[PDB]
């Protein structure tokens, strides 16, 4: 598996989660942020949240692969979308 | 005869449906069958293999004789290694394992909002459409057009393209237009042809 395709798949997975959120309506800090959001999503399970929480798990793993190679539900997901869009452009600056 | 397992992730990326035949299986009717799978943390292995730690999957026999198993929710980038455990009269008989990545087996939705307009002054038909919400990857489009009542097809590879303009032999005639899309990298299925748009 090529590392560039891992990066292409990371950027793509982020866009997918951002799109999932609106349809309802360096790597260490990104990982630390996702971990906090996962804990939040685990306290508010729903059909969409459970799917998003699974994607968040895949995104954290993709972040670790890169390092070693070299309604309250609406409000919570709205903040997460902001954080996700932040990572999406920061990954380009590599 | 080995058992072929084919999977397809829906256009909304919520589930993956897998199917396996029983036609090249009727020879050994006396035997219990069960689909087994092993989920990888990320991506598929270069060579799939039977793993000691596996989980069974609930498959349901359909009218066409195929078993349908639904994985929901889905881990889009986790490697699903599957096989059929056969117990004909004693012991274990595992079919050849195949690994599938749900993100690379997505069948996208047909592109919404298809419009076909003939502008006389230009002499072309501006076929326009809207990309389906999922997948987020780059897409290639295929357009089929012909006399409403003879079909030449055109391919568009620019991912950032919403519309195109093609020539016709008769600007007065009524033409039926359909569009379909697939992942530009080839890792995916073609969507169904959109509802026909008329000039």
From Swiss-Prot, chain A:
Disease involvement: Leptin deficiency: A rare disease characterized by low levels of serum leptin, severe hyperphagia and intractable obesity from an early age.
A Pfam family that the UniProt record links to this protein: Leptin
Gene3D superfamilies listed in its UniProt record: 1.20.1250.10
Effect of residue 55 to Y: In LEPD; no effect on secretion; does not bind or activate LEPR
Molecular function per GO: DNA binding; hormone activity; leptin receptor binding; peptide hormone receptor binding
InterPro entries registered for this protein in UniProt: 4_helix_cytokine-like_core, Leptin
Similarity section: Belongs to the leptin family.
Assembly and oligomerization: Interacts with SIGLEC6.
Name under which the protein is recorded: Leptin
Keywords: Diabetes mellitus, Disease variant, Disulfide bond, Obesity, Secreted, Signal
Description of what induces expression: Induced by secretin.
The protein's role, per its UniProt record: Key player in the regulation of energy balance and body weight control. Once released into the circulation, has central and peripheral effects by binding LEPR, found in many tissues, which results in the activation of several major signaling pathways. In the hypothalamus, acts as an appetite-regulating factor that induces a decrease in food intake and an increase in energy consumption by inducing anorexinogenic factors and suppressing orexigenic neuropeptides, also regulates bone mass and secretion of hypothalamo-pituitary-adrenal hormones.
Gene Ontology CC terms: cytosol; extracellular region; extracellular space
GO biological process terms on file: activation of protein kinase C activity; adipose tissue development; adult feeding behavior; angiogenesis; aorta development; bile acid metabolic process; bone growth; bone mineralization involved in bone maturation
UniProt keyword Secreted present: yes
Cell location: Secreted
Tissue specificity annotation: Adipose tissue is the main source of leptin. It is also produced by other peripheral tissues such as the skeletal muscle. Expressed by intercalated and striated tracts of submandibular and parotid salivary gland intralobular ducts. Detected by fundic epithelium of the gastric mucosa. Secreted into blood and gastric juice.
PANTHER family cross-referenced by the UniProt entry: LEPTIN (PTHR11724:SF1)
Superkingdom in the source lineage: Eukaryota
Gene symbol of the encoding locus: LEP
UniProtKB/Swiss-Prot annotation, chain B:
Residue interval(s) of motif WSXWS motif: 190-194
Tissue expression remark: Isoform A is expressed in fetal liver and in hematopoietic tissues and choroid plexus. In adults highest expression in heart, liver, small intestine, prostate and ovary. Low level in lung and kidney. Isoform B is highly expressed in hypothalamus, but also in skeletal muscle. Detected in fundic and antral epithelial cells of the gastric mucosa. Isoform B and isoform A are expressed by NK cells (at protein level).
Record: glycosylation sites: 87, 192
Post-translational modifications: On ligand binding, phosphorylated on two conserved C-terminal tyrosine residues (isoform B only) by JAK2.
UniProt-annotated stretches for the region Leptin-binding: 38-55
S-S bonds: 7-18, 44-99, 59-69
Residue ranges of every copy of the Fibronectin type-III domain listed in the record: 110-199
Tree of life domain: Eukaryota
Subcellular location: Cell membrane; Basolateral cell membrane
Subunit structure: Present as a mixture of monomers and dimers. The phosphorylated receptor binds a number of SH2 domain-containing proteins such as JAK2, STAT3, PTPN11, and SOCS3. Interaction with SOCS3 inhibits JAK/STAT signaling and MAPK cascade.
Function: Receptor for hormone LEP/leptin. On ligand binding, mediates LEP central and peripheral effects through the activation of different signaling pathways such as JAK2/STAT3 and MAPK cascade/FOS. In the hypothalamus, LEP acts as an appetite-regulating factor that induces a decrease in food intake and an increase in energy consumption by inducing anorexinogenic factors and suppressing orexigenic neuropeptides, also regulates bone mass and secretion of hypothalamo-pituitary-adrenal hormones.
Comment text on domains: The cytoplasmic domain may be essential for intracellular signal transduction by activation of JAK tyrosine kinase and STATs. The WSXWS motif appears to be necessary for proper protein folding and thereby efficient intracellular transport and cell-surface receptor binding.
Membership in a protein family: Belongs to the type I cytokine receptor family. Type 2 subfamily.
Disease: Leptin receptor deficiency: A rare disease characterized by normal levels of serum leptin, hyperphagia and severe obesity from an early age. Additional features include alterations in immune function, and delayed puberty due to hypogonadotropic hypogonadism.
Protein name listed in UniProt: Leptin receptor
């Amino acid at each position: 598996v090529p590392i560039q395709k891992v990066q292409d798949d990371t950027k793509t997975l982020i866009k997918t989660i951002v799109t999932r959120i609106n349809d309802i309506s360096t790597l260490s800090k990104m990982d630390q942020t996702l971990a906090v959001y996962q804990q939040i999503l685990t306290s508010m399970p729903s059909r969409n949240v459970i799917q998003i929480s699974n994607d968040l798990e895949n995104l954290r793993d993709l972040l670790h692969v890169l390092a070693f190679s070299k309604s309250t539900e609406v409000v919570a997901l709205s903040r997460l979308q902001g954080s996700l869009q932040d990572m999406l452009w920061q990954l380009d600056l590599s | 005869v080995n058992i072929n397992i084919s999977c397809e992730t829906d256009g909304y990326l919520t589930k993956m449906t897998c199917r396996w035949s029983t036609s090249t299986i009727q020879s050994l009717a006396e035997s219990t069958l069960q689909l087994r799978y092993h989920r990888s943390s990320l991506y598929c292995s270069d060579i799939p293999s039977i793993h000691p730690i596996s989980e069974p999957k609930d498959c349901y026999l359909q009218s066409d004789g195929f078993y349908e198993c639904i994985f929901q929710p889905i881990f889009l980038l986790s490697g699903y290694t599957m096989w059929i455990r056969i117990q004909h009269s004693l012991g274990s008989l595992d079919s050849p394992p195949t690994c599938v990545l749900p993100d690379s087996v997505v069948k996208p939705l047909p592109p919404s909002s298809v419009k076909a307009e003939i502008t006389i002054n230009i002499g072309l038909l501006k076929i326009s459409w809207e990309k389906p919400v999922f997948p987020e990857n780059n897409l290639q489009f295929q357009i089929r057009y012909g006399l409403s009542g003879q079909w030449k097809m055109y391919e568009v590879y620019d991912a950032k393209s919403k519309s195109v303009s093609l020539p016709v032999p008769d600007l007065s005639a009524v033409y039926a237009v359909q569009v379909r899309c697939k992942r530009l990298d080839g890792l995916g299925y073609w969507s169904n042809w959109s509802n026909p748009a008329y000039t």
